Design a protein around this ligand. Structure first.
Ligand SMILES: C[C@@H]1CC[C@@]2(OC1)O[C@H]1C[C@H]3[C@@H]4CC=C5C[C@@H](OCC[C@H](CO)CO[C@@H]6O[C@H](CO)[C@@H](O[C@H]7O[C@H](CO)[C@@H](O)[C@H](O)[C@H]7O)[C@H](O)[C@H]6O)CC[C@]5(C)[C@H]4CC[C@]3(C)[C@H]1[C@@H]2C
Ligand SMILES: C[C@@H]1CC[C@@]2(OC1)O[C@H]1C[C@H]3[C@@H]4CC=C5C[C@@H](OCC[C@H](CO)CO[C@@H]6O[C@H](CO)[C@@H](O[C@H]7O[C@H](CO)[C@@H](O)[C@H](O)[C@H]7O)[C@H](O)[C@H]6O)CC[C@]5(C)[C@H]4CC[C@]3(C)[C@H]1[C@@H]2C
Ligand SMILES: C[C@@H]1CC[C@@]2(OC1)O[C@H]1C[C@H]3[C@@H]4CC=C5C[C@@H](O)CC[C@]5(C)[C@H]4CC[C@]3(C)[C@H]1[C@@H]2C
Ligand SMILES: C[C@@H]1CC[C@@]2(OC1)O[C@H]1C[C@H]3[C@@H]4CC=C5C[C@@H](O)CC[C@]5(C)[C@H]4CC[C@]3(C)[C@H]1[C@@H]2C
Ligand SMILES: *[C@@H]1O[C@H](CO)[C@@H](O)[C@H](O)[C@H]1NC(C)=O
Ligand SMILES: *[C@@H]1O[C@H](CO)[C@@H](O)[C@H](O)[C@H]1NC(C)=O
Lengths: 622, 309
């Protein structure tokens, strides 16, 4: 059977129409068909499968069958194995999908697409057995194993395989498909991390010490020395020195560390403006440093907006806004900029000067917190950020327990001790603020123990109490109960809850750390991708680069590259050969397994037993 | 026989040797400043620091102890988690301290007190030092305070704290206390627990490897402890001017005997490995399967011959 001649487009649609009618794919196709009929030979048309693929991927299967709108029904498919694998995958048939993937031209991209589609359908699965099978598709495992084989083979063609534009999947980079699939374990592979590190250091050698890099950064002229080694490959000399300067200062790591240094400068300047150079309203004029800070933040917001929106040529504005607001750190950035605007506006007035100063004080905290997200890319710090983000849940559980116990104890003690205090502020104080401070060693017995209560001048009258003429006298009717309750509260809170939280953090750390490392690598990929297009000038200078980019756009990538046809075909054949070798190795290891050998031995011993029994009967006949 | 520059590099490579260099440099500087009168107090201060440096040297001295050395290695490994916690705490503390200093004392020009209220006090908040008398208006004392900057700078009266939005200051103090004194500290405890569990086994081996070198050093060390050691040094110098249990050289016959014994033991070890490989379950399964295939084909031929008769 010749699949290339067997699989025509009409035959493919015939296969798609003959779905089992009891699986998820049939329900999705029916939904699409009803939608198309409402918007208005074969039960399902290629429009329905195209829309299903649009739901599942939304960028890859564009023009797979719409290009010609349907193609010639008798014309054979250009990519038969790709279509067969896609078809077998949409209906949770994994054994067949596996066989088709073993025959496809591009296997890593196919495996990543398969795992993406499986994890997308896992949510839509109705039956628990189907969902369980879908969650164990291990198609990402196939991609990782095949890429491990490829990386062990060449380690130089593997990077080209990662960064090339696949022909079968609409010029989609393998890394792009992995990002779409959110294949975290694939990015955790050593080869992908090595490629990302190579991108990270730019022209410099990846083994360069951090101290040498920092020293060279702080003293620019040392770039032309031999302090840092570079990877190989009047007018000429000037070109050489300019090339060296650019190759050093265009490296993503240098851009990152410059951004960090200038963000530290921003925090220093913000603190100085807020603490020493905060002047009266514009009638007396905001300080020049305050204007510099305003310009600084304007440049920062410009960079944020450019990175979030102007990086992509074609995408819906509403979709881009939703994607931006999806991230929590972007919500923190929005809070920061809103606080900055409100504080500046209130500062410009005189009746709201103090409110503006307060809002700017809060904004400094927000920016200093933004610093953590800035440092997220650090090799030693990022996993810690992930771990803390996971610890937040145990923090919330402890908060629930502590809140219940604290409400109880505080309200009871406020009732027992100050039953005649009408002041709501002081009621809430003695009910919640003081018991909360009891946790941190702040136990003011002068207001709780009669033997320790001072002979201060106190009143019992409510009127005088409200006016604040004298502090309200504490009730000492049953103070033994108050002291006993304080003892029990101290025990419970300061021992049981705190040590329980310590145990929870220990367990959570042990269970989470390994996943946190993989998640850090997966996020590191995206951070390096972002640093690719980021201008090499850190803020507030970044305005020069923004103006230059705007002027160039008005007048007029190491990752995700496109290769010549000959090299592309060579790499495709090399991938196919490596896939064949990997499958042969798996099959050979299966044959030599102890269980397979036992099965073979048992079957052959049974056959030998019956045959030699016949032979012995023949011998006894003689 | 070794290059002087190479020996100097090898010496300065070790961190404890760097600590020793710091100690001796501090001793020299303190003695020099003590010899003068205008720098007497500075010399006393430098010697005070040097005492701390020597008392820290005591740990490296005790490193060879059988029960203490692995603990030294473990602490040296814990330093990294200490640094991670330091980064987190530094970021959070800078944020909270600068914000509270802005909210509470917006008119204090004194840089020393700005840095105090911004970093020293929030740092002490970790260790149960929470002076609410300067943070809560209901707890702020009726002390004699000034608002004027001039008088503030001269130190005539302490600067009055701002109480515009003190609910925000108390809320920020509550959040800072929660985060720092709970999340960061218990996270560091968990990090130390995990690091201890993962590191202890390697720390023991590293302790043994270092113990070898320490015993090698103690081999040639004179038996007289300092300050007496000068007698041994003078004796050694005089002997050098006038004129080992480990790393010994053996006679030719004994050397050849030990070489042949080593070869025999190596042959025995290799034979044991090969024998254990032959008797392994996997090798037995492979042998059985191959012999069963051969027996199958051969007995099939035999049965064909028998059926021919
Ligand atoms: C292992 C475990 C640990 C936890 C716990 O169980 C065991 O420990 C138990 C110990 C127990 C506590 C043991 C003892 C007591 C005392 C008792 O009062 C005795 C009754 C009398 C009658 O009102 C009160 O006395 C007097 O009050 C007056 C207040 O008007 C004071 O006037 C003051 O006025 C001025 C103050 O400004 C100044 O002039 C002086 O300062 C002073 O003159 C007197 O000086 C003082 O004599 C109440 C109960 C209490 C606190 C126990 C509570 C429970 C424990 C903590 C147990 C734990 C479970
Ligand atoms: C479970 C969890 C724990 C954490 C938390 O959430 C829940 O707890 C919440 C509790 C809450 C707090 C609850 C209550 C309050 C009070 C409120 O002020 C009310 C407004 C008024 C208006 O300015 C202020 O009042 C007055 O100020 C004056 C200062 O000029 C005082 O004058 C003093 O002058 C002299 C002082 O030397 C002396 O004569 C006397 O000492 C006294 O006369 C008055 O006495 C006092 O009446 C501000 C907010 C605050 C602190 C809450 C903050 C947030 C919490 C901690 C929550 C946590 C998240
Ligand atoms: C963590 C929660 C947040 C929300 C809340 O409880 C803790 O905060 C508390 C702070 C309280 C304030 C504190 C001070 C004053 C001033 C006083 O003249 C009148 C009453 C009022 C407004 C109080 C009303 C009730 C409030 C909001 C409490 C509220 C349930
Ligand atoms: C852990 C870091 C070390 C470095 C540093 O921050 C913490 O130490 C702080 C101590 C500060 C000092 C403390 C006291 C005074 C006296 C005062 O009349 C003039 C200002 C000056 C010199 C301050 C300048 C800024 C200094 C060095 C801060 C500096 C960023
Ligand atoms: C309390 O107030 C009264 C008012 O007359 C006064 O006589 C008395 O001395 C005051 N005591 C204290 C401790 O202030
Ligand atoms: C504060 O200083 C003034 C100066 O006249 C003085 O009259 C007043 O008694 C002082 N108050 C305190 C509490 O020292």
């Amino acid at each position: 059977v010749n699949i290339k001649q067997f699989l025509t487009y009409g035959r493919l649609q015939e296969l798609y129409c003959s779905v089992s009618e009891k699986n998820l794919l049939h329900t999705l196709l029916l939904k699409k068909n009803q939608e198309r009929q409402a918007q208005l030979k074969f039960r399902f048309t290629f429009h329905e499968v195209s829309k299903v693929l649009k739901d599942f991927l939304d960028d890859t299967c564009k023009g797979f069958y719409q290009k010609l709108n349907l193609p010639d029904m008798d014309r054979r498919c250009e990519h038969p194995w790709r279509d067969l694998f896609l078809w077998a995958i949409l209906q949770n048939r994994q054994e067949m999908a596996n066989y088709f993937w073993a025959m496809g031209p591009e296997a890593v991209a196919a495996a990543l697409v398969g795992c993406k589609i499986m994890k997308e359908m896992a949510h839509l699965a109705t039956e628990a057995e189907s969902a369980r099978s879908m969650k164990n598709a291990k198609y990402e495992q196939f991609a990782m194993d095949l890429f491990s084989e490829c990386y062990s083979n060449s380690e130089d063609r593997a990077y080209s395989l990662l960064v090339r534009k696949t022909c079968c999947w609409s010029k989609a980079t393998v890394l792009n498909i992995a990002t779409l699939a959110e294949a975290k374990c694939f990015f955790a592979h050593d080869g992908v991390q090595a490629l990302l590190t190579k991108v990270w250091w730019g022209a410099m050698r990846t083994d360069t010490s951090i101290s040498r890099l920092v020293l060279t950064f702080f003293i620019p002229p040392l770039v032309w020395t031999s302090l840092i080694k570079f990877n190989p490959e009047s007018a000429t000399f000037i070109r050489v020195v300019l090339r060296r300067w650019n190759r050093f200062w265009s490296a993503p790591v240098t851009v990152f560390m410059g951004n960090v240094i200038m963000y530290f400068a921003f925090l220093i300047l913000f603190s100085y403006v807020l603490l020493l150079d905060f002047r009266p309203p514009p009638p007396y004029g905001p300080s020049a440093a305050e204007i510099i800070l305003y310009f600084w933040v304007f440049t920062l917001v410009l960079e944020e907006i450019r990175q979030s929106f102007f990086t992509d040529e074609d995408m819906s504005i509403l979709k881009k806004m939703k994607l931006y607001v999806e991230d929590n750190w972007n919500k923190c950035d929005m809070v920061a900029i809103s606080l900055f605007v409100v504080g500046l506006s209130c500062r410009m007035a005189m009746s709201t000067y103090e409110a503006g100063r307060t809002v700017l004080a809060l904004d400094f905290m927000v920016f200093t917190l933004r610093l953590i997200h800035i440092f997220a890319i650090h090799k030693q710090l990022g996993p810690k950020i992930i771990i803390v983000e996971r610890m937040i849940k145990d923090v919330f559980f402890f908060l629930f327990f502590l809140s219940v116990w604290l409400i109880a104890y505080g309200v009871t003690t406020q009732a027992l001790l100050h039953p005649n205090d009408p002041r709501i502020d002081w009621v809430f104080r003695r009910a919640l603020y003081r018991p909360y401070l009891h946790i941190f060693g702040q136990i003011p017995l002068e207001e709780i123990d009669a033997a320790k209560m001072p002979d201060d001048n106190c009143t019992t009258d409510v009127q005088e109490i409200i006016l604040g003429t004298l502090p309200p006298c504490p009730n000492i009717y049953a103070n033994w109960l108050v002291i006993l309750l304080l003892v029990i509260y101290l025990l419970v809170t300061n021992v049981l809850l705190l040590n329980l939280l310590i145990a929870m953090f220990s367990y959570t750390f042990q269970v989470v750390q390994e996943n946190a490392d993989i998640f850090w690598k997966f996020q590191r990929y995206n951070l390096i991708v972002e640093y690719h297009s980021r201008p090499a000038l850190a803020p507030p200078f970044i305005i020069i680069s923004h103006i230059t980019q705007a002027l160039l756009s008005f007048i007029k990538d190491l990752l995700e590259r496109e290769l010549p046809s000959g090299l592309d075909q060579k790499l495709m054949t090399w991938e196919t050969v490596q896939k064949e070798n990997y499958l042969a190795k798996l099959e050979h290891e299966h044959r030599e397994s102890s269980g397979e050998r036992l099965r073979y031995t048992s079957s052959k011993v049974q056959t030998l037993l019956r045959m030699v029994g016949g032979f012995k009967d023949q011998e006894k006949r003689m």
